[PDB]
Design a protein around this ligand. Structure first.
Ligand SMILES: [Cl-]
Ligand SMILES: [Cl-]
Ligand SMILES: [Cl-]
Ligand SMILES: [Cl-]
Ligand SMILES: [Cl-]
Ligand SMILES: [Cl-]
Ligand SMILES: [Cl-]
Ligand SMILES: [Cl-]
Ligand SMILES: [Cl-]
Ligand SMILES: [Cl-]
Ligand SMILES: [Cl-]
Ligand SMILES: [Cl-]
Ligand SMILES: [Cl-]
Ligand SMILES: [Cl-]
Ligand SMILES: [Cl-]
Ligand SMILES: [Cl-]
Ligand SMILES: [Cl-]
Ligand SMILES: [Cl-]
Ligand SMILES: [Cl-]
Ligand SMILES: [Cl-]
Ligand SMILES: [Cl-]
Lengths: 219, 211, 219, 211, 211, 219
């Protein structure tokens, strides 16, 4: 990654064995559960495009997801090229060439070039741009590998309401939807799919009851 | 987090894999036992709002608690907005816009903005403000997930007094006293404690009922 | 904790995950064996009152001991208030308010105030003062939870003298007594409670025999 | 490795026990699966030729692969010598002799010489040149140790399409496409994929054959 | 310990949780086998007397050995006092009082005083002096806890000579030679070693009795 | 070890618990397999003679090898004394006494003296000289403890050629021979000791076939 030294300068640092192992292990243990994505984002904090490719390439197996990831990356890279055409011309001494989509993705750019873009003033955050593409692709993989639909999450006749809300928002989280969609799904299904006894208790709370009040009422 | 380097400047530093793993593991092993909250506070020392959201988002499962957390955060964010109305106007050079509730919560603010507020002179500690909201929400989760009432913690007829006080104050901590303790002791220890008189310390009470 | 940087200044540093885990694990594995106290002291090296409260609060269970700990802290805090009454008046720019007992204990003082006291010239070591109170309370807990009295430590007819001395000073250590009391208990019980065969050998060594000579004689 | 300190100078640093153990363990657990190579590249970040030889030499067993590695290294070293003839002559003050192939490979060069080439202005990155040769040799080992041909990867009659694509591109990675994928799908999924038309993404193909 | 920072000044640093755990674990697993002493010396590198007392005090059990350690420390402390009589008088600015034996042992000296002696010019290495006393006491414990005499280490009639030399010098290290080795070899290897003549190296002796 | 700070000066640093544990564990798990030697060299990077003695002394058991190690060290130390006689005379202020063989081995030299030799300009690398002696002794131990001769490595009638080459060069590596000897042993035994079917295939490849071609041919 690119870290700041004690001279105020942003300096490249080697990816650590702790970071490499942590990412490999979380993929082995959790596959593509929704919480793997924020773990990837945090483990790739300050990462260069080279570091991001390293984390993706160190993953063994799951090559169907990795190949889908590469397709999303190429779609986003092509869009960047459509929006930012490179202007031919010799590069100035203190300047850097404008990055292509494949340069942001680390496939046609060197580490030195990525350091140059990231440590420029103003910086071109090719690592954060690339990470935005990878997470976009990881969101589709999580959504695709989600086994259960939110419509099929219904509270059992003897299931505690706490456990049913756990399954509800776990299934809802694997959708990788916006907060507006999450709130629309909550107002459409959480109360309506509760079991008969708890549903009656929740209807009498009104639409303005908080989840804390809802879980308390069906305790 | 935002840490001081070895020269004296407040500099952003990436959250470490050790910190990420420690928080994930303590939630996996302890869920939301009361001691998880001080662990969260210490692991999030100097954290930015982004770091706090990272720690919350890396938790798998417990999504009912996570959703309650988000509601408490939104309640506190709305209160901050009611108390700190935003003053429209262009931000001066070297200055920063006043943060909204959603800015403190890291949802409408960039990392650079959070670093700017935290490293300002005087600083606006959006990380500590956000952490205060999260811990407030985590306290509600602990109380809700507390299985036992303090009224049902009674010393067994042959239970050592030390073990009963352990269960008493463990239950009491989750439910978030000194005379209720004597009331729920067993008959034999209750008689000994009555003969101690008011003002006995817990050390003196436990000594008297050693058996 | 408060650590020194390379500018000669004492600077606050976040408590590390290694320190947090080490303290939690030693309490889980060793409870309140006597050697837990020096482990607590070392793990809390340079700790602020906030760090000390963090270590105590991260402990799950053992709440009877924790509650006794808080009582000892309050007794020591009240004594500090009796000995150091706070003088009302506005605080100077480069100065700090005098700490109360609850300020040393971290309950009515902020982290910034604790850093200010600890990094002052001369420093007010609220962390070391608080640690002195906690260890005082931990000493009472270890003494209370000690299962065996030193009077009941007697050498078996076929027990090796080495193992009996191990049990003797393990029991004696859980008393948390001064070295004078340890020496008084040694001169009163170690030889007198040895088994018949070894006791006769030790009597013929005289009161001036070292433990090395005593253990050698009954080998 | 050669790392930049916290002042800006490129300084040699000892290879860490964490790095040594990580490389030994990944070879023990994964042998020469394709993902071992990017792990080697990352663990050898900034490595000198001495560090690269250290990592290779700490591997126990797999000596047939290690011996193939040495042959590939010697082939690349000889090519470097053919392309960069050494110019005889005394080296000037503050200058360094041009490295031979065996110097890049760390066998005829001292650590000081490798540090000098890597920290020169302009630098001669003998570590990155050497690493390029090693990875070239590691690629040959992966290809040789690949057990299955892509022609033999066919979807089972009741095998989930997701698992078949996993095996397809795992085999394809070791053998180091989009229409071969459809050809080797089972009859039921093949009919669905034919009806998708050319230009379907892998996401669309996997969605269609979800079953 | 007292370590040099990255600018050149000797600065006190807290003993690390890694060091504390490593010392506790090696005592738990190895007790007082001879190799524990060099482990103690290395783990206590640059240690102050306070750090040395911390490491000794974190040991659970083995209190008979710990009590022998304290007696040896007191014997060495008394000798230091006999050799270095304290000169009464007020300490000058920027100066330090001469340490007593109990000051070197960390029992009557503060951490600041130990840092002052160790960082003085010239330094008084109370940590290294104290460590010398502890290792002297640890050597007595190893000798006392050594179970086997070198006289009872004899090669079995069918025991490999390599394993017998292992036991010989392991016992010899705990008891803290080259002809005793030949004397306690079995008849078959003894005849081979007699025919080697005096002056044979251990390598030559082990080669001759390879069997 | 001796590490460089951020002042350009070579400064002594304490051996780390990670390094101490790693060396002890690799000896426990791998004994004197050939790959233990490069692990020792890397773990002792920048080590002083004191650090090298620490690593050797922390090893429990294997005292026959340790005692052979000490004999090789003494032979190399005596040779150094024969080649570098010490010139008597008072040492200058900014100078250091010339090291003896026992000084390089850390037995008659202090840590400060070893730091002085290693950080001098020009430096006297007593750590690298001592490490050269230890590795020389470790090479003899590995060679002595090797169970199998290269002459007895023959391919089984149904053994894959890949596995036979593994055993060949594992046995050959435990000889600790020069690359010339390794190439001479390869040209003398690898093809000649292959099984009948693979041997005929390899003879038809010619002496100029690479190992990659040889392993491919007998796949
Ligand atoms: Cl690391
Ligand atoms: Cl995986
Ligand atoms: Cl994310
Ligand atoms: Cl790859
Ligand atoms: Cl880490
Ligand atoms: Cl808290
Ligand atoms: Cl998320
Ligand atoms: Cl840590
Ligand atoms: Cl516990
Ligand atoms: Cl203590
Ligand atoms: Cl708490
Ligand atoms: Cl390390
Ligand atoms: Cl690669
Ligand atoms: Cl080697
Ligand atoms: Cl640590
Ligand atoms: Cl030692
Ligand atoms: Cl103690
Ligand atoms: Cl360490
Ligand atoms: Cl061993
Ligand atoms: Cl080597
Ligand atoms: Cl030793």
């Amino acid at each position: 990654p690119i870290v700041q030294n004690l001279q105020g300068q942003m300096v490249h640092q080697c990816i650590s064995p702790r970071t490499l192992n942590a990412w490999v292990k979380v993929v082995e243990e959790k596959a593509f559960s929704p919480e793997v994505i924020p773990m990837f984002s945090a483990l790739s904090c300050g990462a260069t495009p080279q570091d991001l490719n390293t984390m993706l390439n160190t993953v063994g197996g799951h090559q169907a997801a990795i190949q889908m990831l590469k397709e999303t990356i190429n779609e986003e890279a092509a869009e960047w090229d459509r929006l930012h055409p490179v202007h031919a011309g010799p590069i100035a001494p203190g300047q850097m060439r404008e990055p292509r989509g494949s340069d942001i993705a680390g496939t046609t750019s060197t580490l030195q070039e990525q350091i140059g873009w990231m440590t420029h003033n103003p910086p071109i955050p090719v690592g954060e741009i690339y990470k935005r593409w990878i997470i976009l692709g990881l969101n589709k993989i999580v959504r695709m590998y989600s086994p259960t639909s939110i419509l099929d999450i219904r509270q059992g006749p003897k299931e505690p309401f706490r456990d049913y809300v756990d399954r509800f928002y776990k299934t809802l989280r694997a959708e990788q939807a916006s907060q507006e969609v999450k709130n629309a799904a909550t107002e459409t299904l959480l109360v309506q799919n509760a079991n008969p006894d708890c549903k009656t208790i929740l209807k009498a709370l009104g639409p303005g009851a908080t989840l804390e009040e809802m879980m308390t009422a069906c305790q």
